[PDB]
Design a protein around this ligand. Structure first.
Ligand SMILES: NC(=O)c1ccc[n+]([C@@H]2O[C@H](COP(=O)([O-])OP(=O)(O)OC[C@H]3O[C@@H](n4cnc5c(N)ncnc54)[C@H](OP(=O)(O)O)[C@@H]3O)[C@@H](O)[C@H]2O)c1
Ligand SMILES: NC(=O)c1ccc[n+]([C@@H]2O[C@H](COP(=O)([O-])OP(=O)(O)OC[C@H]3O[C@@H](n4cnc5c(N)ncnc54)[C@H](OP(=O)(O)O)[C@@H]3O)[C@@H](O)[C@H]2O)c1
Ligand SMILES: NC(=O)c1ccc[n+]([C@@H]2O[C@H](COP(=O)([O-])OP(=O)(O)OC[C@H]3O[C@@H](n4cnc5c(N)ncnc54)[C@H](OP(=O)(O)O)[C@@H]3O)[C@@H](O)[C@H]2O)c1
Ligand SMILES: NC(=O)c1ccc[n+]([C@@H]2O[C@H](COP(=O)([O-])OP(=O)(O)OC[C@H]3O[C@@H](n4cnc5c(N)ncnc54)[C@H](OP(=O)(O)O)[C@@H]3O)[C@@H](O)[C@H]2O)c1
Lengths: 244, 244, 244, 244
């Protein structure tokens, strides 16, 4: 089992991709700490993890929340070996309608969060001479998308951040990578009309949406000892929607 | 190739790249408004622009400063046709030494500024069905660089922003593009040791530093009517240091 | 911006993009040699070039034809300063239907031709310590396209070739670059059904086809003294169809 | 075990990366057919594979050799499920010294081979509604390298080819991907002076060469059912030497 003895922190693990990531790391031997933004969300994460981890309330924009969560992780489980930055929001609008706080909230939540959490786990990874940081990107970070300039900025920015951090820590056995999903099936997409789905599918050579478990498999590959020579990279998981 | 009757605003036009951009747009017939962060800096810009423009004090992190500058431009010259986002700062540090405000100030000054300024000029461009937005990026935005994770995040971010904005306004005759310099002769590079220079030149096939005027030429090409089918693109001007 | 005293060779200059390139270089002061695959095609090129150049018959797959054309150019005009590799063909088919000669002919005509022509002009450029090589790529080289695996291979290949050549000759004042058009109005596109056009326009933010002159403007920029710090680069001119 | 019941064909499996790929696929349940260019090389492959596969003599430039090898595979094992295109050569020279046959041999061996072998296995993959094609690229295909314009052309070209093929076959459950190694330890590199090594290591943030087994792990990930939503992609395995 790949992750026996490892402690993973997966931000935004309530559902969909973040839950599939948490469950996959559990299935391969890790102890997982999954986060949500509320105390009930955190309890629902504890309920699915059971004996293989815990749910905690974390707001990745608030440094006091980050510090409190990591202290709790350290007391109960130990140091973080694997950080998976999945927490992310969208607040879409065309530029002229985009409010200052819609811009700021996305930049804080989706880009500056990657800085804060990576900084907060890095020292203990450097001491172990081994670490994994994986952030969940988006195809929109590379292509752009009308009405999502805030989101695209954050998702492109976290790649620049990750490349620079990778260059600093590569020689100490820590890799820093991004997984960029395409269109993935969630509750959201399951609620759409057949016509809304058909237009999304038309953009995907594979002819289907991706599944959360497909993103989890890519994360788990990069987090494993079989990916120790991959750093500063973006792994695109999108059914051929965008080929780099 | 002529800009007669066009109004350009070039942020951070005191020296180096921003000055060369301002002078080059003048040489092609534009009226140019260059900015600096102090009243004396703005006056030095007015001195070199003379009859073909003026200098103004602008803080690109302050919406009140942006609006005051644009209202002055609108009263004296008219609406901005060409926006060149050149203003930017660096606060280098390895991640472990990087203070929260060194992150925040770079994100605000180098990325969020591009959103605020673009938003502030866009309506008048959309009415005319013609416009240019050009932002000065960096090779670091695409490659990453140790000790500049903040700067790389902002410079990568501004590309994602620019692709998204490009997609929103392409059908109204507005293009949005990035020019990414390599190592350019500037106060910054003149202040390096001979050894820091030599090592950076070894990574440049051309075997020399670029000039500010070389960046200005690329900007002036993209700002022209001869580049109306180029949008959402990044023009790398780096002597082969990085080939995309 | 002027090419007075420069000699340019533009392969495949009968019509469309190659003609627009030839005419634009004339308009900027160059003497232009345009090529076609027949003696009547070459004469039609001579008719439009008049006093500012000539047409010649060239087969870019035949080294004897290349050498005969260059010797004619050298006798009448002088050494080539600017090479524009525009010659190219398509032989579309899904992989299972693609005949061996449909693969081979595209590779020979669209990729190996760029090697032979570049090699044939390079020595005189190196002696002068000044030169331009510009090859016309395609968006398909970066994105791929079903039914054009041969064409995509050649157009992607020529970029790898161009980056390698750029690295060899950058320090001698020669740049080597690619211009990658999107969907441009040409005989090809005029011969499509209204439905094939409409579907391709839906993928273009600009909402229109590009013109040959738009490609020519980008080529003329790169061929100029104002682009001496741009090498190994790909300039995408596609109305936002693909944003790198 | 991931590959139980699968037949993999790994071209160029004598040593280094191709051998590590063959051995890794064996270790995960596949029957492997590994190739070499001589009858003794093929026998040495049979010796290491033992009961889990066979060695055969294959020249990927010769269609009669391709057909004979695939007929042998089909009679003894069955249809190919996984094709790994590892066969590759270099014949380096600066452009002016590069002979026509040095160009042609690399294009035939490293690019056209990918077309021929992919075409030869595709029909049976389409019938199974499941398939993997993985080609071994190189960082040089994306960066370029002086003295390797032939190699860079071929390695860039095979990405264009792979993207186009992926677009044709994505909806039938076949993925087509590239693994791009950086600097990998081989017999060659083990024979170098400490000074030659030191210069190579200086370009690699990880501070070490990659191992053949690291490339094999990436191949095996893409060949598995855990990578069914990854197609048309390039996975860079280079210790941060090049970050895309
Ligand atoms: N779905 C797709 O097709 C797709 C495609 C590409 C990329 N992505 C990326 O995948 C990730 C998952 O998002 P999603 O839309 O798929 O599903 P989601 O269920 O909305 O997940 C978002 C998660 O982020 C957490 N979160 C939000 N704001 C936060 C904050 N301030 N602090 C900490 N956690 C916060 C949420 O917490 P609660 O549990 O408390 O709400 C939730 O767990 C995001 O990074 C997204 O950008 C998704
Ligand atoms: O080094 P540099 O390269 O010369 O570029 C920095 C430029 O950006 C300007 N700049 C820095 N921070 C700014 C802010 N907050 N708002 C507007 N312009 C700013 C600087 O103004 P100053 O010329 O006033 O430094 C300078 O012109
Ligand atoms: O469609 P198109 O686009 O108009 O471009 C094709 C151009 O490339 C030229 N071309 C095609 N095959 C060639 C070869 N083997 N050698 C030189 N030029 C070639 C064509 O010459 P022609 O004008 O003679 O077709 C034509 O000018
Ligand atoms: N080593 C690195 O650092 C590195 C880096 C990036 C990419 N690569 C790529 O990895 C692959 C392995 O090459 P290598 O240099 O690492 O080791 P290598 O041991 O030289 O492998 C090359 C293999 O290709 C086979 N081959 C050569 N010409 C052939 C032909 N005409 N038909 C069929 N097979 C042929 C050889 O056969 P024989 O066994 O009969 O000689 C040999 O098995 C190549 O695609 C290479 O471009 C390697």
């Amino acid at each position: 089992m790949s992750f026996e003895g490892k402690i993973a922190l997966v931000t935004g693990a309530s559902r969909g991709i973040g839950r599939a990531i948490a469950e996959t790391l559990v299935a391969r031997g890790a102890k997982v700490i999954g986060t949500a933004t509320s105390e009930s969300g955190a309890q629902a994460i504890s309920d699915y993890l059971g004996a293989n981890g815990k749910g905690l309330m974390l707001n990745v924009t608030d440094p006091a929340s980050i510090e409190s969560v990591l202290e709790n992780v350290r007391a109960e489980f130990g140091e973080v070996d694997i950080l998976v930055n999945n927490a992310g929001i969208t607040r879409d609008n065309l530029l002229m309608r985009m409010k200052d706080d819609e811009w700021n909230d996305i930049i804080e939540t989706n880009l500056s969060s990657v800085f804060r959490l990576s900084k907060a786990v890095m020292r203990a990874m450097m001491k172990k001479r081994h670490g994994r940081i994986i952030t969940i990107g988006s195809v929109v970070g590379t292509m752009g998308n009308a009405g999502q300039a805030n989101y695209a900025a954050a998702k492109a920015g976290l790649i620049g951040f990750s490349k620079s951090l990778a260059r600093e820590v590569a020689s100490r056995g820590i890799t820093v990578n991004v997984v960029a999903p395409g269109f993935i099936e969630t509750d959201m997409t399951r609620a759409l009309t057949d016509e809304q789905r058909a237009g999304t599918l038309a953009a995907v050579p594979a002819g289907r949406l991706g599944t959360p478990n497909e993103i989890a498999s890519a994360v788990a590959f990069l987090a494993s000892d079989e990916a120790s020579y991959i750093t500063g990279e973006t792994l695109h998981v999108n059914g051929g929607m965008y080929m780099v």
